Design a protein around this ligand. Structure first.
Ligand SMILES: CC(C)C[C@@H](O)C(=O)SCCNC(=O)CCNC(=O)[C@H](O)C(C)(C)COP(=O)(O)OP(=O)(O)OC[C@H]1O[C@@H](n2cnc3c(N)ncnc32)[C@H](O)[C@@H]1OP(=O)(O)O
Ligand code: SF4
Ligand code: SF4
Ligand SMILES: [S]
Lengths: 399, 374
C-alpha cells in the first residue's frame, strides 16, 4: 500500500462525495484555503476549495480558457488568477479537467488575503447563497489583541448558528470536540512530515511534492482518513531518510527556499530545470501554514491559530518565518517568486528579501510568474535566473 | 463666486502650505488620514487637523524599492511622496488596512518612513455584528491613545461627541451642496464640483462648513438651470485630475452625482447618535453602504447608483477605474450589470496618476457623449 495512491484517492473522494451530496440534495460549500474548517466538519458538511480546484486545473493546463472566460465578462487580468479561473468555472458551468459542483453556501476567511472577500461577495451575489465570514483583521502588533480574539470567537459563534440553519442540524458539543482532536493531530502530522527535509541531506523528497500533499491538509484537515494518510507517508519518508533515498532525481548539490506558490501551469518544467542543476527546496514556510495548533475545546487558542497564519502577521514576523526556514533547512540560497496574482505576498517581498539576506548572509534571486495564469511565466527567464543563483552558491561553496 | 472658489483653490493647489499655516496659527499638530475611511472626529476632538491623503500626479522612483509595478497607482503615489518627504510636516498618519495594498503600504511605511508615526486601524468585515462594533471600538480606543501619544494631552469624551456634531453638520451641508449643484448643472462644471468637495480634506470641517454654506447661498439666489448637455454620475476611488475634468467639460458633460470614495462616499452616511462617543463612530461603519471597501454580500452598490441616476435623470454612469485597484475591479462586472440592466449606459475609463498622456479617456468620453445623443 503506497501513500500517494491513498492520498490521490482520498483527494478524489472529496470531490465525488461533494457531487453525491449535491445529487441527494445536501448542501455543498466552497471555502478559502485556511478557513476554520472545524466549524463545518462538525456538521458532516461537504466542503470544496476553489483555490485547490484552480491549482489543479492550472496544472492540467486548463486555467487559461477559464481566465479568458472570466476576462470576457469584464474581470480584469489584475485580479488573482485563482478568482479569474473560478469565475470562469462558474460562468462556464464547470470544466472538464477537474470539475466540481456549484456551492449552496460559502466559507470565507481573509487570514490569507483580502481578495477572497470581494471574490466571495461576487459568488454570493451571483448565486444568491449564504456567505459565512470569519474576519481575522491583520495583526500589526506582534501579538493578537484580545479584541481580535473576542471578535473571532464571536464570529465562530455566528458561523455555527448559520451552519445549523444550512445543515438543518443542531450543534453537537461532543462531536465538535472530536473534530478538534482530529484536526489538531493532522495539523501536527503536517508540520512534522513536511519538515523532514530540514535534515536528511539528501532530503527524503523533492520540495515540490509538498504542494501535492498540501492538498490533503487543505480539504480534509478534520478527517481521520487524513491522519492515516499522513502516517503512511511519514513511514515512507523516514524509510527513505534511513536509506539515503528520495523522490528527488539525481544529486542534491544545492539546498534552497523558494518563496511563494509555484507556477502550476509550469510545475513540470520547473521541476526538471531545478533538478538538472542539482537544486532542491528543503526550506519551507508552508509546514507552518496549516499547523494550526490549540488545546481541545479552547476557542481562544483556535482563534489565535487562524489569525497567526503567516499571511496575517506584521512584516517583521513574516520576515522571521523566512529567515528561520532558511536556517533550519540548511539552505544555501533563497529563490523568490514575484507572483503577479498575489499582491499581499508581492508588495512586501522587496523589503522582506533584503532583510532575510542581511540576516542569514545567504544569496538570493527571483523570477516573475503567477500560480495559475500561464501568461505571466517565461521559461527562458526562469532558467537563467536559477542558473545565476547556482553560480553564486557554487562560488561561495568552494571557499 | 471667485471669492469662495479662490480660497478652496489655494488650499487644494498647495496642501503643504496650508498644513504649515494651520500648525503655526494654532500651535497644534496635523495627522494624515489615508484613503477611504478614517476616524477624523478623533483627530478633530484633539484640536489637530485631519489631513486627507489621496496621492497626486507624480512619476515613480523611490517607491520602486518597496513596490513592484502592479501596485495601484494612488498608493504608488502616496508612497513616493512619503519617501520624498512630502508628508514630513505631519506628526503621524492613519493607514487603514481596507485591502491588501493598503495593508502592505502600512507595513513598508513602518520601515520606509520611520519619522512619521503609522497608526494601525482595521475595520471589521462583519460590521453588522454587535461583536464587530465592539471590536471596532477597541481599534478606535487604540487609535485614540496613539493620537494622545502624539499631541501629548488627553482627548476628552465630551470633545469627541462635540466633533461628531461638527462633522454631521458638515455631511448634511455637503449633501445639500449636491442638490444645489444638481439644480445648477451648467454653472457648476465638473472641475468646480470637485474643487468644492476636495477642499474639505485640507481644512477644519467647521471652516469648510461655512464656505460651502455661503456658496450654497449665492447659488440659491440664482435661477434653477436646465442642463444644456449630458449629465453623468462618476463612481470609483477618485477623479480629481484636471485632465479628466476638462475632457468632461469640453464635451459639455455635467457631473451631478458621484459614487467616488474621495467625494460623496465620505459624507452620505452620518455618524449615529449615542451616549458613547467611540461607539457612535463605530456604528457609522455599520451603516456605510454601496462601497467597494464595505462588506456586502448583496453588493447593493449597483442598485444604489441606479437610484441616484433616476432621482436626477442622469444620462450615463462613468466608471473611473483606478489602475490596478482589485476591490474595484471585482465590483465592475456586477455593478455594471445592475446599471445597464436598468436601461442606463456605462463607460469604462482608467484612472492613472502616473500617466500624462491621457488620450484613451478623451476618445472614450467623446464617443460616450456622442452615444448618449439619440
Ligand atoms: C499559504 C496559502 C494558504 C495562501 C496562498 O498562497 C494560496 O492561495 S495557496 C493555494 C492552496 N493550494 C492548494 O490546495 C492545492 C494543491 N494543488 C495540487 O496540485 C493538488 O494536488 C490537486 C489540486 C491536483 C488535487 O486535486 P486532485 O488530487 O483530486 O486532482 P488529481 O491529480 O488527483 O486528478 C487526477 C485523478 O482524478 C481521476 N480522474 C479525473 N477525471 C477523470 C476522468 N474523466 N476519467 C477517469 N479518471 C478521472 C484519475 O483517476 C486521477 O487519479 P485519482 O486521484 O485516483 O488518482
Ligand atoms: S493567491 Fe494570494 S490573492 Fe490569490 S488567493 Fe491565494 S492569497 Fe489571496
Ligand atoms: S487597491 Fe484599490 S482600494 Fe486598495 S488602496 Fe488601492 S485604490 Fe485604494
Ligand atoms: S483608496
Amino acid at each position: 500500500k503506497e501513500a500517494r495512491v491513498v492520498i490521490n484517492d482520498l483527494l478524489a473522494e472529496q470531490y465525488a462525495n461533494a457531487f453525491k451530496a449535491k445529487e441527494e440534495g445536501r448542501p455543498v460549500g466552497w471555502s478559502t484555503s485556511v478557513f476554520p474548517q472545524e466549524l463545518a466538519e462538525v456538521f458532516d458538511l461537504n466542503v470544496l476549495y476553489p483555490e485547490n480546484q484552480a491549482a489543479g486545473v492550472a496544472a492540467k493546463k486548463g486555467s487559461l480558457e477559464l481566465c479568458e472566460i472570466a476576462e470576457s465578462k469584464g474581470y480584469s487580468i489584475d485580479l488573482c488568477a485563482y478568482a479569474r479561473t473560478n469565475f470562469g468555472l462558474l460562468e462556464n458551468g464547470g470544466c472538464e479537467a477537474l470539475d466540481m459542483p456549484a456551492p449552496d453556501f460559502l466559507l470565507c476567511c481573509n487570514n490569507i488575503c483580502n481578495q477572497v472577500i470581494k471574490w466571495y461577495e461576487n459568488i454570493s451575489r451571483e448565486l444568491d447563497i449564504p456567505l459565512i465570514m470569519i474576519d481575522t483583521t491583520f495583526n500589526n502588533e506582534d501579538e493578537v489583541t484580545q479584541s481580535r480574539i473576542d471578535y473571532i470567537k464571536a464570529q465562530f459563534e455566528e458561523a455555527i448558528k448559520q451552519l445549523e440553519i444550512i445543515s438543518g442540524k443542531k450543534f453537537d458539543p461532543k462531536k465538535f470536540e472530536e473534530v478538534m482532536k482530529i484536526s489538531a493531530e493532522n495539523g501536527r502530522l503536517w508540520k512534522y512530515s513536511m519538515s523532514l527535509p530540514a535534515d536528511s541531506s539528501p532530503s527524503p523528497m523533492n520540495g515540490f511534492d509538498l504542494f501535492t500533499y498540501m492538498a490533503v491538509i487543505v480539504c480534509a484537515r478534520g478527517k481521520k482518513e487524513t491522519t492515516e494518510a499522513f502516517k503512511l507517508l511519514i513511514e515512507e519518508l523516514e524509510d527513505n531518510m534511513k536509506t539515503g533515498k528520495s523522490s528527488f532525481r539525481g544529486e542534491e548539490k544545492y539546498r534552497i527556499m523558494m518563496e511563494g506558490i509555484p507556477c502550476w501551469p509550469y510545475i513540470g518544467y520547473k521541476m526538471k530545470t531545478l533538478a538538472k542543476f542539482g537544486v532542491n527546496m528543503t526550506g519551507s514556510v508552508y509546514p507552518h501554514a496549516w499547523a494550526l495548533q490549540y488545546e481541545v475545546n479552547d476557542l481562544d487558542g483556535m482563534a489565535v491559530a487562524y489569525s497567526t497564519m503567516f499571511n496575517n502577521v506584521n512584516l517583521d514576523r513574516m520576515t522571521k518565518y523566512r529567515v528561520d526556514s532558511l536556517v533550519e533547512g540548511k539552505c544555501d540560497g533563497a529563490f523568490y517568486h514575484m507572483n503577479r496574482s498575489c499582491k499581499l505576498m508581492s508588495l512586501i517581498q522587496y523589503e522582506m528579501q533584503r532583510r532575510a539576506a542581511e540576516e542569514t548572509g545567504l544569496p538570493y534571486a527571483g523570477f516573475d510568474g503567477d500560480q495559475a495564469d500561464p501568461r505571466a511565466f517565461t521559461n527562458a527567464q526562469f532558467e537563467t535566473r536559477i542558473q545565476g543563483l547556482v553560480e553564486v552558491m557554487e562560488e561561495r561553496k568552494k571557499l | 463666486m471667485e471669492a469662495i472658489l479662490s480660497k478652496m483653490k489655494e488650499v487644494v493647489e498647495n496642501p503643504n502650505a496650508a498644513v504649515k499655516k494651520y500648525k503655526s496659527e494654532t500651535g497644534k499638530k496635523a495627522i494624515g488620514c489615508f484613503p477611504v475611511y478614517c476616524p477624523e472626529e478623533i483627530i478633530h476632538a484633539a484640536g489637530m487637523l485631519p489631513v486627507g491623503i489621496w496621492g497626486g500626479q507624480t512619476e515613480l522612483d523611490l517607491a520602486k524599492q518597496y513596490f513592484p509595478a502592479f501596485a495601484c497607482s494612488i498608493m504608488q503615489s502616496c508612497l513616493e511622496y512619503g519617501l520624498k518627504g512630502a508628508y514630513d510636516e505631519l506628526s503621524g498618519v492613519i493607514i487603514p488596512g481596507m485591502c491588501d495594498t493598503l495593508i502592505c503600504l502600512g507595513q513598508n511605511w513602518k520601515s520606509a518612513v520611520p519619522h512619521i508615526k503609522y497608526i494601525s486601524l482595521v475595520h471589521p468585515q462583519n460590521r453588522k455584528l454587535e461583536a464587530g462594533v465592539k471590536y471596532l471600538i477597541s481599534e478606535y480606543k487604540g487609535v485614540k491613545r496613539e493620537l494622545e501619544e502624539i499631541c501629548g494631552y488627553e482627548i476628552e469624551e465630551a470633545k469627541i461627541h462635540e466633533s461628531i456634531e461638527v462633522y454631521n453638520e458638515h455631511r448634511k451641508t455637503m449633501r445639500d451642496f449636491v442638490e444645489v449643484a444638481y439644480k445648477h448643472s451648467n454653472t457648476i462644471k465638473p472641475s468646480i464640483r470637485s474643487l468644492v468637495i476636495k477642499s474639505g480634506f485640507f481644512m477644519r470641517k467647521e471652516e469648510h462648513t461655512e464656505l460651502v454654506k455661503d456658496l450654497i447661498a449665492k447659488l440659491n439666489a440664482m435661477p434653477e438651470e436646465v442642463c444644456s448637455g449630458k449629465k453623468v454620475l462618476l463612481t470609483g476611488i477618485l477623479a480629481d485630475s484636471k485632465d479628466i475634468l476638462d475632457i468632461l467639460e469640453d464635451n459639455n458633460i455635467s457631473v451631478v452625482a458621484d459614487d467616488l470614495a474621495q467625494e460623496t462616499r465620505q459624507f452620505r452616511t452620518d455618524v449615529p447618535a449615542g451616549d458613547d462617543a467611540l461607539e457612535r463612530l463605530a456604528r457609522q461603519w455599520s451603516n456605510i453602504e454601496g462601497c467597494s471597501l464595505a462588506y456586502d454580500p448583496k453588493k447593493k452598490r449597483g442598485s444604489l447608483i441606479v437610484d441616484e441616476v433616476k432621482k436626477k435623470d442622469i444620462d450615463g454612469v462613468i466608471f473611473c477605474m483606478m489602475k490596478f485597484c482589485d476591490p474595484e475591479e471585482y465590483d465592475y462586472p456586477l455593478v455594471r450589470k445592475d446599471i445597464e440592466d436598468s436601461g442606463i449606459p456605462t463607460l469604462y475609463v482608467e484612472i492613472d496618476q502616473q500617466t500624462q498622456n491621457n488620450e484613451q479617456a478623451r476618445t472614450r468620453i467623446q464617443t460616450f457623449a456622442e452615444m448618449m445623443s439619440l
